[model samples]
Target chain A: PLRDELAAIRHRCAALPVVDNRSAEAILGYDE
Target chain B: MMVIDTSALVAMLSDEPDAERFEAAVEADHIRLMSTASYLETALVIEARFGEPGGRELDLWLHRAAVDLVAVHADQADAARAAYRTYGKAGLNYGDCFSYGLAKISGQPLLFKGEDFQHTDIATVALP
Candidate 1:
């Protein structure tokens, strides 16, 4: 049940700030 | 978001004489890094020797700053253990056993601003 919320966590991971937050916006498909 | 090496973190937390720059580097966070098993090993060493809490506080900062925490998988666990022994033979501490091993395996380049780390020829970042 711990990682059961991975969808949000993974989604948050996608939103995680990186070298390029602009590119980070493109999580899986969406533009940052 | 650089992985704050144990040496650097220790210097920062304990105010070791030459720790200012290393501590400053970590605060600046130019590169991305993560907390993991290897990093914890480094923290525990500091706690054991200096009796200061390091991991939980740093983990909070890491999460707040969104620094990625690299997970140490079984492969990294095995490799870091080996590297720890190797480094021990070399008369250096491999406190970042889990983190370094994970980095080595993930092909993530490490930034070793610490003096001893500069001598290594691995894929690492070190300023001259």
Candidate 2:
């Protein structure tokens, strides 16, 4: 299954800033 | 408009380190689109991980974002179905294949972090 590969993708790209403004509220709690 | 895959969406929402390029694209107002199916995939993943509150936030946030949601055209439905059969065996989901079908037909690259995209004909931009 490619699930292993897909799961590892985040680590491979770790150290990069991929912000989703749409969901940033949850991560950053900036809405408050 | 380029298509966004679920992998990139997860990275973006989690504030993952590799999300720089993805965030840049979002802030740059690049015309990014995702299949309605892909959108649902993302929403469900968020809901599963963070509960109803998470889902509610994402629903509201998407409305405020510049990205648009699109459906696979009827003509592309056949391609999606076929892709589902072939790629599904390879471990890609129907939503991902639908995104790929849309990309293949539209010749639009996918903004994603999934290696599954590399296996398909669709072009992919890394989330990082």
Candidate 3:
């Protein structure tokens, strides 16, 4: 089903080794 | 395809401590899609951070990065409005709801870094 396909994609994304936070440069840039 | 949120975009753009993984995904075309709402939010944020010149630079970078920018149609707008009507009370904002709207409409998961979407039934793929 379509839902399954999306779920699989999400599952894979969740497994990615990345941080769950914002960047200082990006934040400072936004503050500018 | 997946819907990228402002939070995730900010994290990646800011060079967050662990952004390389996200960059790799984008490079591989695994995380190369986003709704136009996200595109505008990102642009406004880049401008806020770097001014108009910085904004122009970011626009150029996005194109070169091969990110698929998907426009939000009427259906997605209505879906976003409906989600906001129900979830705004839970503190979900318009931009996030817009991303969620597109995620649901397009059957793609939303890539986010915050807890705002924990209440939604749709798929929210959080990063490490």
Q: Which model scores highest in DockQ?
A: 3
- Output the better candidate (1/2) by TM-score: 2
Q: How high is each candidate's TM-score?
A: 0.52, 0.66, 0.68
Best by TM-score: 3
lDDT of 3: 0.72
Residue A4 error for model 2, in Å? 47
Better of 1 and 3 by TM-score: 3
Ranked by lDDT, top first: 3, 2, 1
Q: What is the lDDT of residue B86 in candidate 3?
A: 70
Model 2 chain B: lowest-lDDT 10 consecutive positions? B86-95
Task: Please give the TM-score for the first chain of candidate 3.
Answer: 0.55
List, residue by residue over A1-32, the lDDT tens digit for candidate 1: 76758987998888876754444334212321
lDDT of 1 at B101: 70
| Clashing pairs for predicted structure model 3, backbone only | A29-B49, A30-B49
Stronger candidate by DockQ (2 vs 3): 3
